[PDB]
């Protein structure tokens, strides 16, 4: 067994890292992608001297010798901050996702945070919006359950390649009807001024899935004169106050929470008046 | 399309030096290792030198170390081959071929036209 | 350098008959391996990489296996087209190598 250790670069903006090594006391590596466990081809065995690329999925490197030392590399994914178009429904589910160059393959790996499920992707080119896409049945049940989940999704124009695969993007999504299910809980409304009134909620369940809550909206109805107002709220604030209401006049106020694609299901109505 | 042009060839008195040259186009050069390949008259294929994508790492043949020097122009898309030191046994033609990855590895997806390189008095 | 043997150097074959080269190593470079067909005059095409995979648009008609030290290709029909020299070439450590070559000629 020879004494040597390995380093890993962070995960670049390509979407790899190398892997190095280096001597400091026949031998051949072993290098094992985990991630994506439905590719057909996981293992490959190199030269020492050669430090391919890898991406930010995690790994199982070993030093074999010919008459082990295992190293499990972390993953090191790139997090996007613009949340994916999504959409879980009746008849299935649909992903798009920013692409790359042509005839691309794509593997869309996801699992509730907190079922490891792996899908692989013919290869295909940009759509005209600059898109890759793939879709599922409602029998797969993608993403169906109304959690979060955490999805990770990797590239290769030669899938066959172990040492060519790359990193896409890491990101978060709430299953199932999450329109429905992030609807506000608890909403109250309190007398705040003579004229005023301070409307609280709790936090939506999609404030638990990181990146998911865009914004709440409060919803105002007078209902004398019949107007409408929306008052959008930050997804870091749970309370807002509605003024200029008129004595006499009865009052009817929603909240509802929405993501980047989604509107969200108003709450049950409060009625109220000044006092 | 991808398209790999070799020019410079030649003939070349022994003992003196000569420079090939690859022009690249139709992908992104920067992104892939790129080798030189010769083939003697009547003989088989003979990997000269490779080089990586960054030009960090460069590899030759034991006929041709320290004779030969590889190199890329990656904002000109071009690839290089200095050979000094000429000798007869090193007429052949020179093919321009490139690797699918970044590092040298794996085998040649496309390959130029080649050029003939006589090395005589 | 790793020494790379092909056998036969040359054989003559018949349209429809199964063809089988090999390809022996100096080292052991387990699936590091590639196979090239050159018609004359012409840059060598791949057709096979990591010992067994099919380099996309190559008939199924030729397939590759081994693994270590030992290596072939197989032709399963022979066609007109395929009459050429073929070589394999190791990519498991620098300096890479190809074989000697084998030719595929056409007997009568």
């Known amino acids: 067994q020879p004494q040597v250790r390995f380093s890993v670069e962070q995960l670049g903006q390509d979407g790899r890292r190398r892997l190095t090594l280096k001597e400091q006391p026949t031998y051949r590596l072993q290098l094992h992608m985990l991630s994506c466990p439905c590719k057909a081809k996981a293992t490959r065995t190199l030269h020492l001297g050669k430090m391919p690329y890898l991406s930010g999925a995690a790994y199982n490197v070993a030093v074999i010798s010919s008459n082990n030392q295992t190293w499990h590399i972390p993953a090191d994914t790139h997090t996007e901050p613009v949340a994916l178009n999504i959409s879980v429904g009746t008849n299935g589910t649909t992903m798009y996702w920013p692409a790359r160059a042509q005839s691309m393959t794509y593997c869309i790996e996801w699992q509730p945070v907190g079922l490891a499920t792996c899908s692989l992707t013919a290869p295909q080119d940009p759509d005209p919006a600059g898109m890759a896409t793939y879709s599922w049945s409602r029998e797969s049940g993608a993403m169906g359950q109304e959690k979060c989940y955490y999805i990770t999704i990797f590239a290769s124009a030669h899938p066959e390649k172990l040492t060519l695969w790359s990193t896409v993007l890491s990101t978060y999504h709430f299953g199932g009807n999450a329109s429905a299910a992030g609807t506000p809980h608890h909403v109250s409304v309190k007398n705040h001024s003579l004229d005023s009134v301070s409307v609280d909620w709790a936090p939506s369940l999609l404030s638990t899935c990181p990146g998911v809550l865009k914004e709440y909206v409060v919803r105002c109805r007078d209902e004398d004169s019949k107007q409408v107002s929306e008052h959008p709220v930050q997804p870091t604030e749970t309370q807002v106050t509605l003024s200029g209401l008129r004595a006499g006049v009865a009052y009817t106020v929603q909240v509802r929470a929405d993501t980047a694609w989604l509107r969200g299901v108003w709450s049950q109505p409060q009625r109220f008046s000044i006092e | 399309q991808v398209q790999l042009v070799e020019s410079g060839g030649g003939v070349v008195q022994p003992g003196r030096s000569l420079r090939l040259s690859c022009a690249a186009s139709?992908?992104?050069?920067?992104?892939?290792?790129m080798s030189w390949v010769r083939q003697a008259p009547g003989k088989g294929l003979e990997w000269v030198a490779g080089?990586?994508?960054?030009?960090?790492?460069?590899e030759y043949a034991d006929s041709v170390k320290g004779r030969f020097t590889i190199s890329r122009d990656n904002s000109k898309n071009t690839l290089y081959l200095q050979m000094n030191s000429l000798r007869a046994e090193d007429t052949a033609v020179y093919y321009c071929?490139?690797?699918?990855?970044?590092?040298?590895?794996?085998?040649?997806?496309?390959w130029g036209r080649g050029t003939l390189v006589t090395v005589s008095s | 350098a790793i020494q790379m043997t092909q056998s036969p150097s040359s054989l003559s074959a018949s349209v429809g008959d199964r063809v089988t080269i090999t390809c022996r190593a100096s080292q052991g470079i387990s699936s590091d391996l590639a196979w090239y067909q050159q018609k004359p005059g012409k840059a060598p095409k791949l057709l096979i990489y990591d010992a067994s995979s099919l380099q996309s648009g190559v008939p199924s008609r030729f397939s590759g296996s081994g693994s270590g030290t030992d290596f072939t290709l197989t032709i399963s029909s022979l066609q007109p087209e395929d009459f050429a020299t073929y070589y394999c070439?190791?990519?498991?450590?620098?300096?890479?190598?190809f074989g000697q070559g084998t030719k595929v000629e056409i007997k009568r």
């Open positions: 139709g992908f992104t050069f920067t992104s892939y290792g």
């Open positions: 071929a490139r690797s699918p990855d970044y590092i040298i590895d794996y085998g040649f997806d496309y």
């Open positions: 080089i990586s994508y960054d030009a960090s790492d460069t």
């Open positions: 070439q190791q990519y498991w450590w620098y300096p890479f190598t």
